[PDB]
Design a protein around this ligand. Structure first.
Ligand SMILES: *[C@@H]1O[C@H](CO)[C@@H](O[C@@H]2O[C@H](CO)[C@@H](O[C@@H]3O[C@H](CO[C@H]4O[C@H](CO)[C@@H](O)[C@H](O)[C@@H]4O)[C@@H](O)[C@H](O[C@H]4O[C@H](CO)[C@@H](O)[C@H](O)[C@@H]4O)[C@@H]3O)[C@H](O)[C@H]2NC(C)=O)[C@H](O)[C@H]1NC(C)=O
Ligand SMILES: *[C@@H]1O[C@H](CO)[C@@H](O[C@@H]2O[C@H](CO)[C@@H](O[C@@H]3O[C@H](CO)[C@@H](O)[C@H](O[C@H]4O[C@H](CO)[C@@H](O)[C@H](O)[C@@H]4O)[C@@H]3O)[C@H](O)[C@H]2NC(C)=O)[C@H](O)[C@H]1NC(C)=O
Ligand SMILES: *[C@@H]1O[C@H](CO)[C@@H](O[C@@H]2O[C@H](CO)[C@@H](O[C@@H]3O[C@H](CO[C@H]4O[C@H](CO)[C@@H](O)[C@H](O)[C@@H]4O)[C@@H](O)[C@H](O)[C@@H]3O)[C@H](O)[C@H]2NC(C)=O)[C@H](O)[C@H]1NC(C)=O
Ligand SMILES: *[C@@H]1O[C@H](CO)[C@@H](O[C@@H]2O[C@H](CO)[C@@H](O[C@@H]3O[C@H](CO)[C@@H](O)[C@H](O)[C@@H]3O)[C@H](O)[C@H]2NC(C)=O)[C@H](O)[C@H]1NC(C)=O
Ligand SMILES: *[C@@H]1O[C@H](CO)[C@@H](O[C@@H]2O[C@H](CO)[C@@H](O[C@@H]3O[C@H](CO)[C@@H](O)[C@H](O)[C@@H]3O)[C@H](O)[C@H]2NC(C)=O)[C@H](O)[C@H]1NC(C)=O
Ligand SMILES: *[C@@H]1O[C@H](CO)[C@@H](O[C@@H]2O[C@H](CO)[C@@H](O[C@@H]3O[C@H](CO)[C@@H](O)[C@H](O)[C@@H]3O)[C@H](O)[C@H]2NC(C)=O)[C@H](O)[C@H]1NC(C)=O
Ligand SMILES: *[C@@H]1O[C@H](CO)[C@@H](O[C@@H]2O[C@H](CO)[C@@H](O[C@@H]3O[C@H](CO)[C@@H](O)[C@H](O)[C@@H]3O)[C@H](O)[C@H]2NC(C)=O)[C@H](O)[C@H]1NC(C)=O
Ligand SMILES: *[C@@H]1O[C@H](CO)[C@@H](O[C@@H]2O[C@H](CO)[C@@H](O[C@@H]3O[C@H](CO)[C@@H](O)[C@H](O)[C@@H]3O)[C@H](O)[C@H]2NC(C)=O)[C@H](O)[C@H]1NC(C)=O
Ligand SMILES: *[C@@H]1O[C@H](CO)[C@@H](O[C@@H]2O[C@H](CO)[C@@H](O[C@@H]3O[C@H](CO)[C@@H](O)[C@H](O)[C@@H]3O)[C@H](O)[C@H]2NC(C)=O)[C@H](O)[C@H]1NC(C)=O
Ligand SMILES: *[C@@H]1O[C@H](CO)[C@@H](O[C@@H]2O[C@H](CO)[C@@H](O[C@@H]3O[C@H](CO)[C@@H](O)[C@H](O)[C@@H]3O)[C@H](O)[C@H]2NC(C)=O)[C@H](O)[C@H]1NC(C)=O
Ligand SMILES: *[C@@H]1O[C@H](CO)[C@@H](O[C@@H]2O[C@H](CO)[C@@H](O)[C@H](O)[C@H]2NC(C)=O)[C@H](O)[C@H]1NC(C)=O
Ligand SMILES: *[C@@H]1O[C@H](CO)[C@@H](O[C@@H]2O[C@H](CO)[C@@H](O)[C@H](O)[C@H]2NC(C)=O)[C@H](O)[C@H]1NC(C)=O
Ligand SMILES: *[C@@H]1O[C@H](CO)[C@@H](O)[C@H](O)[C@H]1NC(C)=O
Length: 637
């Protein structure tokens, strides 16, 4: 309800394109297919590329009025980015080649032509209607059944964010909408229908095209969160380590997260190994992604407060923790023998990123075990955790460059490892964390923060963890600067979609993703690139869930130089909201709402005064902090 005007999601599921972008050949009244009136008559070989304004998804229907020849055809091509607009092909989903247009033999007669959900286009902003025959074809409409997020009201958000910075607001809502697009009907999964047949080492020529379909049921239930709407349309655990919290503070569609998580845990091996991806992707060993599955279960319990779910899955979670701990060696660090990660290079040995994620997982597991009163596993865990810290900063810390090396035998400093080490509290001091934040920011290029472990690549995925690291190191304006630089490029570059966020690109500002050779296959709607949504709600607005469903919370707004911030979301316990206005580095007004029955703490920084409750309770701030605050509405006096 609040700030609904920023919500990108369509107001219906019956969608005509918004505007005509380009016309080729004799075409009468192309604007008719935008709902502007009349019918559109294609006279011979012709085409019209239409623009929807935003990235959309679903099932195309061609309403034909007449066709002069029995051999007439109408084709439809789709593309996320405008650089792959073509009257001959879509953009790519497979490892090599462009996808074939959807061809309708409309030479029969009048009626609506469709091939249903088997050929759902998972994501596209531009749609080209093509007549490749000398026939005259009149069409009444070409519309889309919008099938992204199938069991929800697309414009009924439970979270919101609005600041004095309009770019930040648009970035928040673009992340939320991206997540909506990646929630699919589970019966239309697996866009990689050519896995095994089409590989990177191949060439599909200009007249050659890839066939595509969507008919693998990837989860149970009626909705699930995938990595990318166009592609892979599969469940990936690492992507959830950014996507879950951004879903939780905007749409609250944690049911799709839950189906994805359950499908992943259903693939656990007897020894506890969790999968690299959901079915039918290759059974692959990946340390880090197994740990991401553990992270995801922990965060799901944190936001839903589902005791029954955690109880169902605690045995599997402990088995996974045991599997990961089996990699720890005499050193006290995990020695990673699997190279598979987020499509980066050099995963192995005493990798800083793997061990930081392990530290994070261990602390998650201890807090969960205390929630469940399962004290037995705690000891080992604590000890192991300590060792990681103690050894990771002795054998991996580079004091001269202010960052962690990737392992013991390299001078490379990975962005993911250092970001995660700050996010997991692997550093021995806040001063260290500030060094890491400063040194990461020192590496920014004209198009955002680099990930040297994956070559000349910018990763919005790792950008989300770096944002969190800048925040936890006490640098909110550094984080807002990275937001502006990287995500304003992702949102406002004319090749982007202006609604959804890219999977990754290159440091020179090109849309080359190094792991892929088929550049049209990069997805422009990946949930793992939506870090700013959760970051702006949690850190800028200061609404931090610290207990199940917000049973306990921390209010720590890190405003920086923003002069006005409003944000809010809900859990099954009630409403969280934060609202403040500043000027000259001081709060003019500050208020926040937390659900009843909850208790929390406050941390405003260098702020002195009283917090007044709705009833009238007054609490003095000591060092900008206060604890034991009872749930409700609070204002700063
Ligand atoms: C998702 O969509 C894809 C299509 O894009 C489907 O893939 C096809 O699935 C069919 C199964 O339905 C595959 O099998 C083909 O069946 C044809 C019929 O053969 C007999 O099948 C029954 C079996 O009991 C007989 O009783 C009956 O009399 C039929 O005669 C065969 O003619 C096909 O031969 C094909 O074999 C090779 C290897 O598979 C193919 O590559 C060739 O095209 C060749 O013609 C075949 O056996 C078919 O192969 C699949 N095709 C493709 C392109 O993948 C998925 O099934 C569908 N999945 C879901 C869940 O909906
Ligand atoms: C400790 O950390 C360092 C730094 O990350 C790490 O060195 C990295 O090792 C990986 C291999 O695990 C290297 O990745 C390969 O490097 C070679 C060049 O030496 C390239 O030719 C490779 O590219 C081709 O091959 C890949 C498959 O093998 C394909 O995926 C790829 O598309 C190419 O076809 C590949 O990049 C990485 O380059 C180095 N790091 C640097 C800076 O070169 C080291 O391995 C870690 N220690 C241990 C024990 O793993
Ligand atoms: C065009 O696209 C539409 C989707 O965008 C299609 O409508 C969808 O049809 C499916 C079934 O084929 C529905 O999925 C069902 O979901 C219910 C649960 O939903 C109920 O609860 C939720 C949450 O409270 C609520 O939002 C719903 O309104 C329901 O009350 C399951 O129990 C079923 O087993 C089944 O999975 C989708 O809900 C429905 N979409 C919408 C928006 O309602 C439509 O059929 C497509 N048509 C064509 C011709 O392609
Ligand atoms: C007729 O419509 C097309 C769009 O379908 C207009 O743009 C042209 O589209 C073709 C593809 O059908 C482009 O060719 C391709 O270009 C990309 C790079 O952009 C390249 O990677 C491919 O290998 C292929 O060469 C073509 O460049 C593009 N032209 C322009 C100027 O954008 C076309 O302009 C329309 N014709 C008229 C007369 O309006
Ligand atoms: C306009 O586009 C439609 C759809 O692409 C064309 O229909 C297809 O035309 C081909 C001829 O190139 C028909 O022949 C088929 O060729 C494939 C190999 O490419 C072969 O494996 C098949 O056995 C068959 O011989 C194809 O059946 C036909 N497809 C459909 C669904 O009708 C149409 O010819 C184009 N017309 C013009 C004037 O460009
Ligand atoms: C949860 O989803 C899974 C699929 O992810 C459901 O199990 C699936 O059941 C279908 C329908 O039986 C299987 O398809 C095949 O059907 C033919 C029909 O003749 C049959 O001969 C095959 O033996 C097979 O049953 C499909 O293979 C199977 N999925 C997998 C991954 O094997 C399940 O029913 C859903 N609901 C739950 C678990 O409550
Ligand atoms: C408590 O955490 C520690 C980590 O500090 C766990 O220790 C590790 O346990 C695994 C179990 O598989 C050991 O791996 C095994 O190593 C032997 C060689 O010693 C090898 O032959 C096996 O194939 C397997 O790889 C690992 O070495 C060990 N590391 C250390 C430093 O003890 C321990 O498992 C956890 N507690 C429990 C009860 O599991
Ligand atoms: C993040 O990690 C830092 C250290 O990297 C944590 O602060 C550190 O807390 C430990 C205790 O957990 C302190 O070590 C010792 O604690 C014993 C009591 O068990 C005490 O008797 C010793 O005098 C010593 O304090 C350590 O000094 C302290 N370091 C700093 C710089 O504060 C911090 O608590 C962690 N933060 C989170 C949110 O987990
Ligand atoms: C956002 O606004 C602030 C305030 O105008 C910008 O400047 C930063 O302000 C703080 C507080 O005055 C400076 O703190 C420094 O502390 C060290 C401690 O030793 C002291 O030596 C300095 O004299 C100063 O008091 C901080 O250096 C300063 N930073 C800069 C670059 O001016 C801040 O830059 C603004 N950020 C953005 C992105 O707009
Ligand atoms: C990419 O998306 C942005 C944001 O949606 C577009 O910028 C413009 O953004 C503002 C809202 O931030 C919209 O303002 C409205 O303009 C209408 C014009 O009639 C006015 O009546 C309203 O009161 C309000 O001021 C504006 O519509 C929007 N422009 C468009 C074209 O959507 C940006 O233009 C988008 N670019 C592309 C190429 O899609
Ligand atoms: C980490 O594990 C790997 C795999 O078990 C170890 O790699 C082997 O190291 C030995 C020396 O101990 C070499 O002779 C082998 O060639 C290596 N094999 C493989 C498959 O990597 C590595 O030594 C382990 N590192 C630590 C510190 O325990
Ligand atoms: C924060 O800790 C770092 C060490 O990680 C201190 O900076 C280092 O100081 C040593 C002094 O011997 C130098 O050799 C290193 O080059 C410095 N490292 C970096 C990255 O600058 C720093 O002084 C500490 N700051 C505070 C306030 O305690
Ligand atoms: C819940 O909190 C609201 C204030 O936000 C208050 O009006 C209401 O009475 C509270 N209900 C209970 C049962 O405490």
């Amino acid at each position: 309800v609040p700030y609904e005007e920023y919500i990108l999601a369509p107001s219906s599921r019956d969608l005509a394109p918004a505007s005509v972008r380009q016309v080729n050949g004799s075409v009468t009244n192309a604007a008719a297919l935008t709902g502007a009136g009349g019918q559109a008559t294609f006279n011979g070989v012709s085409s019209v590329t239409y623009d929807f304004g935003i990235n959309v998804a679903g099932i195309v229907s061609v309403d034909v009025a007449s066709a002069s020849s029995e051999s007439a055809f109408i084709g439809v091509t789709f593309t996320e980015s405008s650089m792959w607009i073509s009257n001959e092909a879509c953009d790519a989903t497979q490892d090599a080649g462009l996808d074939t247009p959807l061809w309708f033999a409309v030479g029969q007669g009048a009626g609506v032509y469709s091939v249903g959900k088997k050929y759902t286009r998972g994501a596209f902003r531009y749609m080209t209607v093509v007549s490749n025959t000398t026939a005259t074809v009149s069409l009444n409409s070409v519309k889309i059944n919008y099938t992204a997020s199938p069991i929800q009201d697309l414009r009924a958000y439970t979270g919101y964010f609005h600041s004095s910075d309009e770019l930040l607001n648009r970035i928040w809502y673009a992340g939320a909408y991206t997540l909506q697009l990646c929630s699919i009907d589970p019966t239309t999964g697996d866009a990689l229908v050519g896995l095994g047949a089409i590989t990177s080492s191949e060439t599909i020529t200009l007249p050659q095209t890839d066939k595509w379909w969507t008919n693998y049921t990837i989860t149970n239930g009626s909705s699930t969160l995938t990595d990318g709407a166009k592609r892979d349309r599969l469940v990936w655990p690492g992507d959830m380590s950014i996507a879950l919290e951004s879903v939780a503070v905007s749409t609250e569609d944690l049911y799709s997260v839950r189906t994805a998580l359950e499908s992943l845990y259903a693939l656990q091996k007897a020894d506890g190994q969790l999968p690299y991806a959901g079915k039918p992707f290759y059974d692959t060993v990946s340390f880090t992604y197994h740990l991401h599955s553990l992270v995801g279960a922990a965060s799901y319990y944190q936001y839903t407060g589902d005791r029954a779910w955690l109880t169902r899955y605690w045995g599997q979670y402990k088995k996974g923790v045991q599997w990961a701990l089996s990699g720890v060696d005499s050193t006290g660090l995990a020695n990673i023998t699997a190279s598979a990660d987020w499509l980066r290079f050099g995963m192995g040995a005493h990798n800083i990123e793997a061990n930081a994620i392990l530290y994070y997982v261990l602390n998650d597991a201890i807090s969960l075990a205390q929630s469940l009163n399962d004290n037995a596993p705690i000891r080992n865990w604590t000890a192991t955790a300590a060792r990681i810290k103690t050894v990771a900063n002795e054998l991996l810390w580079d004091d001269k460059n202010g960052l962690y090396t990737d392992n013991e035998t390299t001078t490379l400093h990975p962005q993911d490892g250092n970001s995660w080490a700050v996010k997991a509290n692997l550093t021995l001091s806040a001063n260290q964390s500030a060094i890491i934040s400063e040194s990461l920011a020192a590496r920014w290029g004209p198009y955002g923060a680099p990930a040297p472990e994956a070559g000349a690549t910018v990763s919005p995925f790792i950008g989300g963890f770096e944002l969190q690291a800048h925040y936890q190191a006490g640098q909110p304006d550094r984080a807002l600067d990275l937001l502006r630089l990287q995500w304003g490029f992702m949102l406002d570059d004319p090749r982007m979609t202006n609604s959804t966020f890219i999977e990754g690109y290159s440091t020179d500002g090109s849309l080359v993703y190094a792991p892929y050779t088929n550049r049209p296959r990069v997805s422009h709607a990946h949930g793992w690139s939506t870090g700013p949504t959760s970051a702006l709600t949690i850190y800028t607005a200061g609404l931090r869930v610290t207990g199940p469903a917000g049973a306990t919370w921390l209010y720590k707004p890190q405003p920086g130089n923003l002069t006005q911030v409003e944000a809010g979301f809900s859990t099954r316990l009630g409403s969280f909201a934060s609202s403040f206005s500043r000027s000259g580095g001081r709060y003019q007004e500050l208020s926040f709402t937390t659900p009843n029955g909850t208790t929390g703490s406050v941390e405003l920084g260098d702020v002195s005064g009283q917090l007044v409750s709705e009833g009238g309770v007054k609490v003095q701030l000591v060092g900008g902090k206060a604890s034991g605050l009872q749930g409700g509405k609070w204002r700063l006096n």
